Amino acid sequence: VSQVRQNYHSDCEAAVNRMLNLELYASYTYSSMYAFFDRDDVALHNVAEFFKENSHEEREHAEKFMKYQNKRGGRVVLQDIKKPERDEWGNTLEAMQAALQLEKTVNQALLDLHKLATDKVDPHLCDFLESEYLEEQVKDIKRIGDFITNLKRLGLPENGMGEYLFDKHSVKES
Amino acid sequence: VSQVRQNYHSDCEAAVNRMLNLELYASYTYSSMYAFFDRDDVALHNVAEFFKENSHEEREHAEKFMKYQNKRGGRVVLQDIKKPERDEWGNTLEAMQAALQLEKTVNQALLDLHKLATDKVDPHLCDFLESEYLEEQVKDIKRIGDFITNLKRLGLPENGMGEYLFDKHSVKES
Amino acid sequence: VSQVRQNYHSDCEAAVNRMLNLELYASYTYSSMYAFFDRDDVALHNVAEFFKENSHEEREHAEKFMKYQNKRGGRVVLQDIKKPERDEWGNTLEAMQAALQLEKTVNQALLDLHKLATDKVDPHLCDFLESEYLEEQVKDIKRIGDFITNLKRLGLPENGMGEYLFDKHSVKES
Amino acid sequence: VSQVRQNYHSDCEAAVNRMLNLELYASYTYSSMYAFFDRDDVALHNVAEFFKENSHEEREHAEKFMKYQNKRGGRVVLQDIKKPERDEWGNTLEAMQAALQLEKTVNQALLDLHKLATDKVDPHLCDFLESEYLEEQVKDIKRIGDFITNLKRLGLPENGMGEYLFDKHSVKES
Ligand SMILES: [Cl-]
Ligand SMILES: [Cl-]
Ligand SMILES: [Cl-]
Ligand SMILES: [Cl-]
Ligand SMILES: [Cl-]
Ligand SMILES: [Cl-]
Ligand SMILES: [Cl-]
Ligand SMILES: [Cl-]
Ligand SMILES: [Cl-]
Ligand SMILES: [Cl-]
Ligand SMILES: [Cl-]
Ligand SMILES: [Cl-]
Ligand SMILES: [Cl-]
Ligand SMILES: [Cl-]
Ligand SMILES: [Cl-]
Ligand SMILES: [Cl-]
Ligand SMILES: [Cl-]
Ligand SMILES: [Cl-]
Ligand SMILES: [Cl-]
Ligand SMILES: [Cl-]
Ligand SMILES: [Cl-]
Ligand SMILES: [Cl-]
Ligand SMILES: [Cl-]
Ligand SMILES: [Cl-]
Ligand SMILES: [Cl-]
Ligand SMILES: [Cl-]
Ligand SMILES: [Cl-]
Ligand SMILES: [Cl-]
Ligand SMILES: [Cl-]
Ligand SMILES: [Cl-]
Ligand SMILES: [Fe+2]
Ligand SMILES: [Fe+2]
Ligand SMILES: [Fe+2]
Ligand SMILES: [Fe+2]
Ligand SMILES: [Mg+2]
Ligand SMILES: [Mg+2]
Ligand SMILES: [Mg+2]
Ligand SMILES: [Mg+2]
Ligand SMILES: [Mg+2]
Ligand SMILES: [Mg+2]
Ligand SMILES: [Mg+2]
Ligand SMILES: [Mg+2]
Ligand SMILES: [Mg+2]
Ligand SMILES: [Mg+2]
Ligand SMILES: [Mg+2]
Ligand SMILES: [Mg+2]
Ligand SMILES: [Mg+2]
Ligand SMILES: [Mg+2]
Ligand SMILES: [Mg+2]
Ligand SMILES: [Mg+2]
Ligand SMILES: [Mg+2]
Ligand SMILES: [Mg+2]
Ligand SMILES: [Mg+2]
Ligand SMILES: [Mg+2]
Ligand SMILES: [Mg+2]
Ligand SMILES: [Mg+2]
Ligand SMILES: [Mg+2]
Ligand SMILES: [Mg+2]
Ligand SMILES: [Mg+2]
Ligand SMILES: [Mg+2]
Ligand SMILES: [Mg+2]
Ligand SMILES: [Mg+2]
Ligand SMILES: [Mg+2]
Ligand SMILES: [Mg+2]
Ligand SMILES: [Mg+2]
Ligand SMILES: [Mg+2]
Ligand SMILES: [Mg+2]
Ligand SMILES: [Mg+2]
Ligand SMILES: [Mg+2]
Ligand SMILES: [Mg+2]
Ligand SMILES: [Mg+2]
Ligand SMILES: [Mg+2]
């Protein structure tokens, strides 16, 4: 037993390692989307940079779980980071739809971890998820939903001018 | 009944007074450790100042419970502050081991108060503990554990040079 | 064929994807070393931060290969990022020995990619490796070798005081 | 023999003069594109200024070869600068397609000069091309490819609104 460990269930320790892996998986998927939108035959550079920034954020969220694990006296156990589901992402609408699904998958895992922490009467882990993860997820899901609504309004996937305008006006200039 | 009181159980009010007393007890123990490391035949002044600062923090945590009690319409009830368990603390390793135990005792009382607040359906008191106490405790327990690991690496209790180096490099210069 | 592609052999494109994966693998190994040295029963925080910074550098080196691939009209193809060889890294000497081996493995892959680029008469890829990768590798290998020499001088693995002093004086204060 | 000449083959000297001429030819083609987009019946002023800036860059690349020739003890020999292939450039897509072809023609001549320098064991000339020309060419080819992709997305040549928007958003405001 770690000398610091107190009120930290083995099941929560393991679930934190699985959550860590899912954050790294989400990072890697966003890396793939960055590289796709940077292709010369795609060439939507503000969209590419949006996904690159998301990739960096998800890696930071993984590192925060590593630090958390050690603060509680759990032990970080790493597994392979699986490659993303697709090698190419179609267009901005298809990519944003996949991003929405990914963000909801991550949110469901965080909610499931909160349920486990609640079951094991771990208020520190509940607070950590509520204070550091759950609101960020709701905000990022809302942002991507708003983007999808605007891509549909702009006539994606068929309307190339609409896709061009989204890259200029909806995502930050990079 | 206080005119402000709402959703505040008598049991929680009493447990807040007991928690207040334990914070003052923890403060007093850290005061004792300060005075010990300031002795001419101990003379580890950065270690002494670490414990003095901890003593001040624990007194602030007691005062925050006094303010909380009054905000909810409970009544502060004070009891004697018991003197610390020891009059002399051996060396930096023994003192840090006692500090780890003290911090885990305080953490267990905070977790027990959270369980009571949960049982009495008091989300304000749960939030107060999660937002103001529980993360501070995990961070301070981790810091002291890290210190103990380093004191053992430095050969305490026998290695006086190791103890000297810990005071110079591990705790803040004062 | 990409409209930008010129003098870029399929074999080099594939080898750039494999090199990308190895950079991500190296990043992940350094992440593991960070988390290990951050453990409460290891607690060498400057060593931990050295490895965390290395992890970030290797992720940047992967991203630079993604950008390169797209500049030449190749296509990024991602594979799983394999978990590191070890779950625990022993001590600062064992970790630095593994880091030296990792850096030499990465260097050998870069040298092998240079040989392939030379064989395929690709001076742009040769320049990219020489200007962005090969000197960084020699400098980082020299730094880790110097560290190993100093850890041995300090009596690792047995001399805990030596290990403590390395963390204070050899790696950047964090 | 020039007093400075060392390891500089007559064939490389002649090929540098031919490369100089091709840079001036590329400059002149970009000058023509500038004047076309500045016409009152074309009137895409940011596109015009993009090509004008390219024209100035290619003249600088010619001057750098003149300076190089003299540094090595070769002798600058000038030939006529041939007028561009077209007197009118159609529209932004046709012009960017011609620019891509021109940039790849210049790149192939630079790669051919690198092959000659390699054959004649001239590492200084190889370094000069790798350090001053080959990466610039890859970056500029990628930029023009990205532009063509976006012009096609915007519905060129038929979509005049798309062409108008490209001039406002894809090329620098002038
Ligand atoms: Cl526990
Ligand atoms: Cl508990
Ligand atoms: Cl357990
Ligand atoms: Cl696990
Ligand atoms: Cl796919
Ligand atoms: Cl998903
Ligand atoms: Cl949050
Ligand atoms: Cl605008
Ligand atoms: Cl009440
Ligand atoms: Cl109520
Ligand atoms: Cl009551
Ligand atoms: Cl009471
Ligand atoms: Cl005593
Ligand atoms: Cl205690
Ligand atoms: Cl807190
Ligand atoms: Cl090719
Ligand atoms: Cl070639
Ligand atoms: Cl090929
Ligand atoms: Cl591949
Ligand atoms: Cl292991
Ligand atoms: Cl290795
Ligand atoms: Cl380098
Ligand atoms: Cl010569
Ligand atoms: Cl020679
Ligand atoms: Cl000659
Ligand atoms: Cl000539
Ligand atoms: Cl014509
Ligand atoms: Cl041409
Ligand atoms: Cl260059
Ligand atoms: Cl607009
Ligand atoms: Fe995340
Ligand atoms: Fe306290
Ligand atoms: Fe690397
Ligand atoms: Fe040029
Ligand atoms: Mg232990
Ligand atoms: Mg377990
Ligand atoms: Mg998973
Ligand atoms: Mg698989
Ligand atoms: Mg919040
Ligand atoms: Mg955000
Ligand atoms: Mg996000
Ligand atoms: Mg918004
Ligand atoms: Mg269409
Ligand atoms: Mg009254
Ligand atoms: Mg009462
Ligand atoms: Mg008590
Ligand atoms: Mg007594
Ligand atoms: Mg907090
Ligand atoms: Mg603090
Ligand atoms: Mg404290
Ligand atoms: Mg620390
Ligand atoms: Mg002794
Ligand atoms: Mg094509
Ligand atoms: Mg191929
Ligand atoms: Mg590999
Ligand atoms: Mg495996
Ligand atoms: Mg070079
Ligand atoms: Mg260099
Ligand atoms: Mg460096
Ligand atoms: Mg490095
Ligand atoms: Mg050095
Ligand atoms: Mg020893
Ligand atoms: Mg002479
Ligand atoms: Mg000659
Ligand atoms: Mg010619
Ligand atoms: Mg003619
Ligand atoms: Mg070379
Ligand atoms: Mg360069
Ligand atoms: Mg430029
Ligand atoms: Mg150019
Ligand atoms: Mg660009
Ligand atoms: Mg039309």
UniProtKB/Swiss-Prot annotation, chains A, B, C, D:
CDD domains reported for this sequence = Ferritin
Q: Which Gene3D superfamilies match?
A: 1.20.1260.10
- Record text on subunit structure and interactions: Oligomer of 24 subunits. The functional molecule is roughly spherical and contains a central cavity into which the polymeric mineral iron core is deposited.
EC main group: oxidoreductase
Q: Where does Fe cation 2 bind?
A: 58, 103, 137, 140
What's a Gene Ontology MF term here?
Answer: ferric iron binding
* Reactions the enzyme catalyzes: 4 Fe(2+) + O2 + 4 H(+) = 4 Fe(3+) + 2 H2O
Q: Which UniProt keywords apply?
A: Iron, Iron storage, Metal-binding, Oxidoreductase
Residues that hold Fe cation 1 according to the record: 23, 58, 61
Q: Which stretches make up the Ferritin-like diiron domain?
A: 6-155
UniProt name for this protein = Ferritin, middle subunit
Against InterPro entries, the record matches this protein to: Ferritin, Ferritin-like, Ferritin-like_diiron, Ferritin-like_SF, Ferritin_CS, Ferritin_DPS_dom
Cross-referenced Pfam families, in alphabetical order?
Answer: Ferritin
How is this protein annotated for GO cellular component?
cytoplasm
Enzyme Commission code(s) on record: 1.16.3.1
Tell me where the signal peptide lies: none
Q: Which family does it belong to?
A: Belongs to the ferritin family.
UniProt xrefs under PANTHER family: FERRITIN (PTHR11431:SF54)
